[PDB]
From a paper:
During activation of a pentameric ligand-gated ion channel (pLGIC), the binding of agonists promotes the opening of a selective ion conduction pore at a distance of more than 50 Å away from the binding sites. Each subunit consists of a predominantly β-stranded extracellular domain and an α-helical transmembrane pore, which interact via an extended interface. Whereas [name] forms a cation-selective channel with high conductance that is activated with high efficacy by the primary amines cysteamine, propylamine, and GABA, the cation-selective GLIC is activated by protons and inhibited by bulky positively charged compounds that also act as open channel blockers of the nAChR. Our study has identified a cluster of interacting residues located at the β1-β2 turn, the β6-β7 loop and the pre-M1 region of the extracellular domain, and the M2-M3 loop of the pore that exert a strong influence on channel function.
To avoid residual side chain interactions with the ligand-binding domain that may still be present after replacing the proline by alanine, we next investigated the mutation of the respective proline residue in both channels to glycine. In [name], the mutation [name] has a small but significant effect on the structure, which overall shows the frequently observed nonconducting conformation. The reorganization of the well-structured M2-M3 loop indicates a change in the conformational properties of this region. In [name], the mutant [name] shows agonist-induced currents with a similar EC50 as WT but with a slower activation and an unusually slow deactivation of the channel upon washout of the ligand. This behavior can be observed in two-electrode voltage clamp recordings, where the activity of the protein after a change to ligand-free solution decays slowly, and it becomes even more pronounced in macroscopic recordings of excised outside-out patches. The cause for this unusual deactivation phenotype was revealed in the structure of the [name] mutant of [name]. In this structure, electron density between Arg255 on the M2-M3 loop and Glu155 located in the β8-β9 loop of the extracellular domain of an adjacent subunit indicates the formation of a strong ionic interaction that is absent in WT and that may stabilize the open conformation of the pore. Whereas the predominantly local effects of most mutations, which modulate the open to closed equilibrium of the channel, resembles the behavior of eukaryotic receptors, the mutation of a conserved proline (Pro254) to glycine in [name] resulted in the formation of novel interactions between residues apart from the site of mutation that were not present in WT, causing an unusual functional phenotype that would have been difficult to explain in the absence of structure.
Author numbering:
A (entry chain A), B (entry chain E), C (entry chain D), D (entry chain C), E (entry chain B): 11 to 317
The structure:
Amino acid sequence: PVDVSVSIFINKIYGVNTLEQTYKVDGYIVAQWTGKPRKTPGDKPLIVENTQIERWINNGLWVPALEFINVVGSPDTGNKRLMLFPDGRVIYNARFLGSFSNDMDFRLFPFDRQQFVLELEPFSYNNQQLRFSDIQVYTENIDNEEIDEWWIRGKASTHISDIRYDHLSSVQPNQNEFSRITVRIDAVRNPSYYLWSFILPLGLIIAASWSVFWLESFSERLQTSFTLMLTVVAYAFYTSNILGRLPYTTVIDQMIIAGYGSIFAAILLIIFAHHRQANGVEDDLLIQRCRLAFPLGFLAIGCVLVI
Amino acid sequence: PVDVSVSIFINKIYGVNTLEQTYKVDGYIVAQWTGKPRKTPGDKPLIVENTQIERWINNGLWVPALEFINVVGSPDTGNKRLMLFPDGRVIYNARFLGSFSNDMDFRLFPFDRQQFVLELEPFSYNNQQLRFSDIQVYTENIDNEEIDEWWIRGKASTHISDIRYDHLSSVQPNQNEFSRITVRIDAVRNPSYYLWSFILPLGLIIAASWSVFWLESFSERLQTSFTLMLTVVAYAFYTSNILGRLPYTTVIDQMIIAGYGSIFAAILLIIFAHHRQANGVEDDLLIQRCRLAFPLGFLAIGCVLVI
Amino acid sequence: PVDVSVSIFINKIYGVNTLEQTYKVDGYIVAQWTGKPRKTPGDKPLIVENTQIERWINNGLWVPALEFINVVGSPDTGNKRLMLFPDGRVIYNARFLGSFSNDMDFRLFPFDRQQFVLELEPFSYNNQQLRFSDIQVYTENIDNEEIDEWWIRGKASTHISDIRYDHLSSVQPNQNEFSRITVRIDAVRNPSYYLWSFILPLGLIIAASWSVFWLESFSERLQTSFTLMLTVVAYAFYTSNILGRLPYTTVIDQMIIAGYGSIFAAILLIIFAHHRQANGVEDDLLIQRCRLAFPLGFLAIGCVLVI
Amino acid sequence: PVDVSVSIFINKIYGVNTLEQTYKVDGYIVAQWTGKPRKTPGDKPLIVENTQIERWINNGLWVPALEFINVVGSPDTGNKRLMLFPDGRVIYNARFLGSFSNDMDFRLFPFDRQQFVLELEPFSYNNQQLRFSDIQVYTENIDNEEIDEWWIRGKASTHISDIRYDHLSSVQPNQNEFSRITVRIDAVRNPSYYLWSFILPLGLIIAASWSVFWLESFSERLQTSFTLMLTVVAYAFYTSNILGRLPYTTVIDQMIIAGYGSIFAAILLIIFAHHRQANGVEDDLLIQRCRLAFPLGFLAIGCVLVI
Amino acid sequence: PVDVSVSIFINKIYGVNTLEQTYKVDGYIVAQWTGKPRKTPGDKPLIVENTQIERWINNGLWVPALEFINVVGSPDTGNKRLMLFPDGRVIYNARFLGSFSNDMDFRLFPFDRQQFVLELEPFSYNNQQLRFSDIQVYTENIDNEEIDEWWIRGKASTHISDIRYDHLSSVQPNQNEFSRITVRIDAVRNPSYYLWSFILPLGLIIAASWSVFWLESFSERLQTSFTLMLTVVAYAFYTSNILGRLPYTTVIDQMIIAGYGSIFAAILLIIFAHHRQANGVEDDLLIQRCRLAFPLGFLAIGCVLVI
């Protein structure tokens, strides 16, 4: 079994696609193994780049194809090199930008955490083994984080493993295990923006919706609530047009629904206080009670959301 | 006729385009047939990848071109391999990401069901037969379903068939039948998001619009209804800007129209009760009747929507 | 002059770009002519695909370049084959997806009609003639039409002609005429969606805008009209954000302008009735007259729109 | 110096990008020069297309590379031919679609005028001269203009000139001047759509905003003005979501700002009339004066906008 | 060590991607070094373009690969030439369009400043040195600046340095330092558009929001504030749909938050004055005091924002 050691340099992780559960990775990938010794110009290692790389393969050079398992579409490979050492070593180095998929959960949206993963396997060889995997996620850890959108919690974890494929031919007795490198990078989203520009104004709106009870007339209380209803819809839209459409409701989307509920419950209470008492009494003990109880019931129900 | 057996591995189905009736499919495709025996290095099967694959075809190797019938534009083929066995077997393995089209019906939008299909035929050969089709849709079936946007009901169905092309040349007496593999995967949309963030708020709005009759004055009743009218339009827009523009009205689009109708019918009733009775009587038996009857008539018409 | 007969199979026409006046066409293109007889393996016609096609051209095989005149950018050609017959026939078959342009008029938007055209010419040869053009637009004609966005009125019409290019070199005495195939497919847009989700609610809004006269006070009439004005703007936006921005006003855009006019004319009449009569008389004979005349004047002006 | 004559056929100019100051040009490009005489099949001119063009360059044929100076990214070249004449003439013909940049000013937005320019230079040769430039902008000039988005005022102007590059090597004594063809096509935007769907409704709204003074109470006048304030914001948005974001304010963008100013100035006057006079007099001579003067001051300031 | 001198011509910098922190650069890149002397046709320098460049590399010509370190994906290379001098000089000239990344701060949005950087390194050689870097940012400096979106303060700065890579093989004793060219261009955003179309109208709205205190009744004061609240939401959306979603709050985003606060603070004060005084006194000394103090407190807090 050929011993192949890879090294992965990560420059930039960006472009998270929430609907497709994908993200972009730009960086370099190096792989090194030892083969037959070779006659090289002089005795220095030979450097072969780009189009000339295919030429050595035509003359018989073995360069195994390594596939990104979780890549979504063929990645963009920039420059690529072959390092031919006289003692048999071979080092392949290539710059790449690719889009990768992983199971990503966004239910706890502004405060969510994710891990960007890479999965690397040889495309056709099981009789060749990934020897050791060193990844260098050299991006700032303490420089610009409150400024950046994602916070990388710690240096990446590596794990080389063996994957068992069952459905093969009928001629393979036992060589159906492939070497797989699995890289994991944990990251947490920066909630700062969504707090100030989304959650807070919605709170102010939802809070101000409770001040509908401080109106004196019943007509004032019911009519105004319809203008409040419109405000939530308009704010529900402002949110959606910028955030997007996930398959599941988010925290902000739950707050949006809560705004709808608070206002509709106020409409019911406002109508209730009018026609609840016999002979046209306006039940002022309710309008004044829920004048502060309606804010409190919303805070009490909100704490069970974190159950 | 050459016996060709294919295997299709499906990694990911995503990116449904409702207007174009298309969807993205990432996976692998394997095809195996038996040809002339061959001298191989030693006696082990030879592996040929990527650029070297074309070289064997230049020297005379027969590799038939298989086309995805329902593909929309050339698919992205990642790595591809040739497995050359000494006893004559040939295994072609290729990673692909492609967009496929199918007749897709979206009238019952949030609750619609679809099937993603793949259609594979030899491009030029009818004297070559697809022998058996095994597809492995190994994606979760009981892991993350309430979390994902689509729910795969069951394992995919396969069907090898014969397609008759009429309009050919004039030299083909009887060889105008091509082997076609047709794969079908059934899936149902996860309605969770559209229920909570779209259908529910619209219900709350449509319901609250009926509380206009609980206003005491006629001026109050008619003026407020115009604010309700604006609210539906604003909600119609919140919906449309996020969902899109389908060629046919959806379930949600019908509810929006129902909202418009309920409000416009309320405007008619509110004006009617005012000027229906002689000498300016306000017909209070109407405003109080439809105070609860207007909610009931909407529920009665909604049940005939499912007729 | 070489006799070349072409066949065009049309699988799918989609993605109309209203601003760029373009549309997408997926299908196949076949071309057949008779050349020198040839020695083939055995005596059966030889099949040459994809990369192997260029090789025969290197060894001298004449394969003319046919250009889509109205194509917008190089189209995406999938698989391509050459059928080499021993008696001299040559059949070129290629799958393609391309974007084509034509003069498209959208002034009668929801009810507009269009024709999708294809124009095919030899790129460099005038001494070679397109012999006959058979196109197979085998898409449903009576299956799913009320469901699809476009309705194909009938099977495609074809027209082979000769195009005279003037500005050529100085050495061409008379060979400046090229053979051109022109395929035309007429289609009418399905107005269902735009009627129910756009035209109807606008009518309801415009109609309800006339109910401003059923208010009793002048203050009510003028103040409410400002909320109606806002409602049209909000609806004008809902329309535009989903449809788009054409270079010319559409039917829907004219109705929107009619909404602006109806409301603005109501403001004038509402203000007129107040200060028209001497000593502050409110001219109640006007508010009651245009209470129904304003709906009628809009219906009368709408009929002259179809003049 | 080699004498090269070019001809540029322009089929379609579309896709203006206001922010990037670019536009799309589809057409053909022809170049002709006279070189060494040549032995050709028979004695007829030889036609070489697409992949075969590169082959003649390998055997030594001189085909100069012509670059579009103001192109943004490599253009999409469709079919290309070589016409090899026996007397030494060589004609290169290629279809192309490319994006070109020019300084484009949009300050007078609906009524702006632009010129789409093409700049063509040899990439590496200064000892080779562009002999004459004929461009054929055969697009309708009197057919569909009120229907199309841009109006071409007249046939294009051509200009071959000499460009002096300074910063070269140290070995070039006098050969640092390159031949440049400069084609200019003047075009004016079709304002019809923006007048009817943008400028006119804004005028109606801005006009109707002045009718706030026809309200009798002070409370009516100030409260309504806030609804007018909201209406302008909604209309400012309807405009922007369809037009876009230019680096400078447009004519329409100025009208929007004028709407904001008129309403805010109205708020000031409405509040002014209330508390300007001692002992609570409402200064009715102001409300009735600016009832018509406020429309007049807006027209007077609007005329100085064209100073 | 080989002496390589580069020259970079920058034609156009556009397409700032605020979320991805990237920008597009179109221009040329030239590199010159001296190698072995060579026999050339006649004795003039030989010009090799495009496809022919690869051919000399096959026969042994050394052309090092230079990588853009901060490029995001492989850039679009237009025409490229090789200048082969007989005395050993070699000049490589290539047109390119690429997207580059740099750390970009947008916190002070309309008034922010940025620098567009290029980073150029040899891909595989450390025993080869970038000799001198001349970049020609010949774009207007005093022509169109108030018209363009960005203002380039001055000509670009250059910086050749040495980059030390640690994690290399085990056979490199001391050759782990690579030459890096770093070009920097400073630019300031044109705030004109954002001042007139965003900052000014928001100021008027926030200012006009303070005129709610000039209403006489308490019912008037609270009801109108809900219409003001909606106005901020509508304007918050107008802003966002055109600007986008940055990871951090901007100056404009802060003003939006200030608008919500002023209105929400107004709601509290309006309700306070009603129920603050015993026996139902309306505390008119408060409504008139903050009639001007509320504008002043907003101006007083706004100056501490620039702290």
